[PDB]
Amino acid sequence: GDWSFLGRLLENAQEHSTVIGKVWLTVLFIFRILVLGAAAEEVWGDEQSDFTCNTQQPGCENVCYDRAFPISHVRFWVLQIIFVSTPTLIYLGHVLHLVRMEEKRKERRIAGALLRTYVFNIIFKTLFEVGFIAGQYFLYGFQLKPLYRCDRWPCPNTVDCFISRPTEKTIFILFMLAVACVSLLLNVLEIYHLGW
Amino acid sequence: GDWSFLGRLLENAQEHSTVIGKVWLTVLFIFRILVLGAAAEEVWGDEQSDFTCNTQQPGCENVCYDRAFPISHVRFWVLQIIFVSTPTLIYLGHVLHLVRMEEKRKERRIAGALLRTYVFNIIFKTLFEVGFIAGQYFLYGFQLKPLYRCDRWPCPNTVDCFISRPTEKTIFILFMLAVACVSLLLNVLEIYHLGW
């Protein structure tokens, strides 16, 4: 995963952002992207190769892994990172557009319409963070148990399947939840600093 | 299985038995002992070696075979043959005892006490045949289905196990049932010929 281009754009957003916004971006880079690439990806590397079911039925392990893990937590976190970054890019684009328009007018910061877009950016960021949190909760909860009981065809009756690294995965699930909640708190602080 | 000694004693009983009794003994020799040794034993030879369960659990196939087949049909039929033969041996022993006593008295057939023992022999034969029939019914029924579902520990949850030769085994189950019922009819005819 090469996050270079998103990083380069979000550092530009850092130049035009509030101090709390700069903190939020630093959290995104260090506590989400960096952890994901240095720690979590490895943890989940053997998610299917080390997933085992007590059965001689061909195809059962495939369908049972798929049912247990419709989307890997790491993929979900990648999507979450991209969506919570997107409004920042929208605001930065409006910034660059107004700067280029100003340069043109000359040939021939946060107030006004730019402040309205900034605050909308903070709102959409908040809603997307909340949505991904709640989706993670309703899909997986905040804990991975070692045992998964599977009755999906072709599996005969109910089969016992065993997860790879349930405890380490639970640790990182809770870590990423905490980081997301810190991000929400930062957004709320941005909207209370702007309000005040 | 060497039935030589039982055969030699039951042929003696044939010498002292009624014509219907001789038919009964012939049925025992030809349609039970001979079939058991020439056909059924082979059918059941691979009862456990060819019994298969869809599982990776060590020990599950053992416990599941044991639960499905607490006693093999062939062992049950051996026991049945021996018990339905036993009263015949009792009657023959009473016969030989009275003959030896007569020889002694000389030194120094079916009436009297010998007829009472004969009729008791026919009664116990009938009750034992009925008992083994009903036991077979309550234990296995009169049909072996290919699939046996097993939840006995250590088997995880419910496991699918497959029987060896279910249809051939069902054929021989029904054959042996029919032979037993013919034997019962013969006993009833003995008691109606004696009554008349």
UniProtKB/Swiss-Prot annotation, chains A, B:
Function of the protein: Structural component of lens fiber gap junctions. Gap junctions are dodecameric channels that connect the cytoplasm of adjoining cells. They are formed by the docking of two hexameric hemichannels, one from each cell membrane. Small molecules and ions diffuse from one cell to a neighboring cell via the central pore.
Location(s) in or outside the cell: Cell membrane; Cell junction, Gap junction
Residue spans, topological domain Cytoplasmic: 15-18
Gene: GJA3
Cystine crosslinks: C53-C161, C60-C155, C64-C150
Tissue: Detected in eye lens (at protein level). Only detected in the lens. Not detected in heart, kidney, liver, or lung.
PTM annotation: Phosphorylated on multiple threonine and serine residues. Phosphorylation may have a role in assembling connexins into connexons and gap junctional plaques, as well as channel gating.
Family: Belongs to the connexin family. Alpha-type (group II) subfamily.
Topological domain ranges for the Extracellular compartment: 40-70, 143-170
Domain of life (superkingdom): Eukaryota
Self-association state and partner proteins as the record states: A hemichannel or connexon is composed of a hexamer of connexins. A functional gap junction is formed by the apposition of two hemichannels. Forms heteromeric channels with GJA8.
Sequence intervals crossing the membrane: 19-39, 71-91, 122-142, 171-191
Intramembrane segments: 1-14
Coiled-coil features, chain-numbered ranges: none
Protein name: Gap junction alpha-3 protein
Organism (species): Ovis aries (Sheep)
